[PDB]
Amino acid sequence: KPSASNLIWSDEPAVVVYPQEDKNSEGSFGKYRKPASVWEAEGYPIGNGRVGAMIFSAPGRERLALNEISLWSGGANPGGGYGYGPDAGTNQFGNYLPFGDLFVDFKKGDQPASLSVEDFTRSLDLRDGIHKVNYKADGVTYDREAFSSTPANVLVLNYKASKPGQFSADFSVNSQLGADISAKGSVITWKGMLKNGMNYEGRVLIRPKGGTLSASGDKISVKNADSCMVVIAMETDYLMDYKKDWKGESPSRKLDRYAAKAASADYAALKQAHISQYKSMFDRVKVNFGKTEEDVAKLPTPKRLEAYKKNPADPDLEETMFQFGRYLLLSSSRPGTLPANLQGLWNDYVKPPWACDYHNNINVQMAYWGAEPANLSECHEALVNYVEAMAPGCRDASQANKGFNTKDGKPVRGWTVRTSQNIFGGNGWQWNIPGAAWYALHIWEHYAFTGDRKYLEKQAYPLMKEICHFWEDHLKELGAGGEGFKTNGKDPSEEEKKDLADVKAGTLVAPNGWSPEHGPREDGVMHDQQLIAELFSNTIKAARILGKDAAWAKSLEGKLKRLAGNKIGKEGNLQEWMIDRIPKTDHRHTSHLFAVFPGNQISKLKTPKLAEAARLSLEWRGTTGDSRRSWTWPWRTALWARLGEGNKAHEMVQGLLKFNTLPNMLTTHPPMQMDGNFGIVGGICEMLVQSHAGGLDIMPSPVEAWPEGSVKGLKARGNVTVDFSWKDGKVSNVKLYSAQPKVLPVRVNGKMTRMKTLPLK
């Protein structure tokens, strides 16, 4: 009986193909059309935040498509273009790249291993972070395991069998980048230098027990061994420091310190240390949404998802999706290394969709939506450390932009970003002028959730203040009744000016904005205003907590009160623009609901009239086929959840799974984009616990699809850990934990109580 949840698995061997089209036979793709389509749907991913693999296991062959998170082309990209590809140099944007592949060709004796196998399963077990294969052939049971170890800092593979002397295979490395590959002794080494100067090296260290080991050509063969452990180690000379030209130690010198040592350890010891580190992160949150029918829970994941599409009743599969988002984030994001990109850290493409980059118009943010509420707070440090380290490049691009110059012709203070960023301070494509303000929301929430004052004073507040200065420089002043307002460059019409009537003098608006991704270009679009008000408000809070810059903070509190704010339109919707344009639209985006989520300005508790207007706006967006994207479902999940529509929020979870999830549970835009996986964690957390509206609010509205369940380990602002259960329409067993004894207002079961915390075990 395969576990009903936290296990992704298939009874079908993976399709194994080379990422280079020309390297594959006529029908090697099975039901797919191209190697990329195979890769995104068939692979199971492992990672330790820095190195990872997408694993394609079959009885005859096995492909590990390999990644190290810093392998990037491109560079400073001073012209702001969006050119990429593996040969992109310092004057271009560049892209995340594939590191290599390990191919394993299994043999029986000296002939190919048979595919006449029995009881084949390949599985990604989320409970221990291990990819597992198991099958039977000719009375012999074979087992494979693979994981990405944080303590050992390598990928570890292990092949075993029920009888001695049964393991034979040929190991080979594939590169799409022209790497130089050579085998010697028991190690395959591959290395290269990108056109932008980045050096990289990988090593595959083969460690059989028994049998023979020979190195012919650049392949390595193992014959008639008992078992075989493999270590895969990979490094670049990337260093996240612009003052060092982004260059640190050579990759060979890094690998010399640890790879051989890891390959010399005992497999059982490597495995135990991995599982222990892994559970220390994964086990922080446990949820139960209900019990799926045993006949449905027995289905392999591809068939279970096809079944879900026709009858979406599978709370255990939804629990798996939720935990997969946590698994993917902890596997792609750690404090000392780069943040998760559009695909986490997994990529097979030399020219990936959207450069597999850092998109700050929603994607990178959504990637971190689960970091704080789902108890993976240290993962969020990777994002903030990145933002700090890329800022000198953003200041360069922002100062070079004469369009940002103040009225005195001086360059702007602070910085903002273009829509895309690489790992060298480069910015690409359209300016995303409020994007740094949105970064500042993550910078503040890391403090709101942890209470880490050192973080706030040393890292967060200096960034926030600089982003504020940019807006103190770029905001535009309006006269009474909208005097000065521009829309698409022209003055407002007489009908338009009727909306502009109540605008007091000195009103501050972001000039010439765009509500993402439709309409006109005009002053004070509500998306911009909300992002700025959130930036100013949180920076002001930070200053007073740190007792710093009191004068400028009260100065800012005045500009905050002068910003154009939210308006309820004549039809009752929340306005998306200063002008009262019709809310009936199918448009995908709901950019003026930022203030409901992920922002903090509109809540049911604190601003009921604005919330009901927001709820009408979202209702009138409807749900059409074009509103189906990897990133719409999780945002609408969180929105509906915060607006008290639990059932609507659950319908968005179902929609993600029905329409935008691949057979391996990776979300797809299309093509594959992990924002959905990452973001649905945040959306589901808001269905269970809210802490943005003045205190803890536990399951504020029911979810009929989850009549009975429980959670342990969710995080709330102020660094509180939350456990509870629910059954019928009642929440019970509410228990709050903190490090310091506190007393808190708690809304639960429709009543506002006050409870004290228990100490954090």
Numbering used by the authors: 25 to 785
What does the paper say about this structure?
The high quality of the electron density maps allowed the trace of residues 25–785. The (α/α)6 helical barrel of FucOB displays a deep groove where the active site is located, mainly flanked by solvent-exposed and flexible loops, including loop 25 (α7−α8; residues 357–386), loop 28 (α9−α10; residues 429–458), loop 33 (β19–α13; residues 547–550), loop 35 (α14−α15; residues 587–614); loop 37 (α16−α17; residues 651-655), loop 39 (α18−α19; residues 683–699) and α-helix 8 (residues 387–392). A first glycerol molecule is deeply buried into a pocket defined by W378, H383, W655, and H693. The O1 and O2 atoms make hydrogen bonds with the side chains of N387 and Q697, respectively. A second glycerol molecule accommodates into an adjacent solvent exposed pocket mainly defined by Y106 and W453. The O3 and O2 atoms make hydrogen bonds with the side chains of S444 and H383, respectively. A third glycerol molecule is located near the first glycerol molecule. The O1, O2, and O3 atoms interact with the side chains of H693, R612, and H613, respectively. The crystal packing analysis of FucOB and FucOBE541A structures reveals a strong π–π stacking interaction between W453 with two prolines residues, P765 and P783, of the neighbor protomer. Consequently, this protomer restricts the entrance of the substrate into the active site, supporting the inability to obtain a complex crystal form.
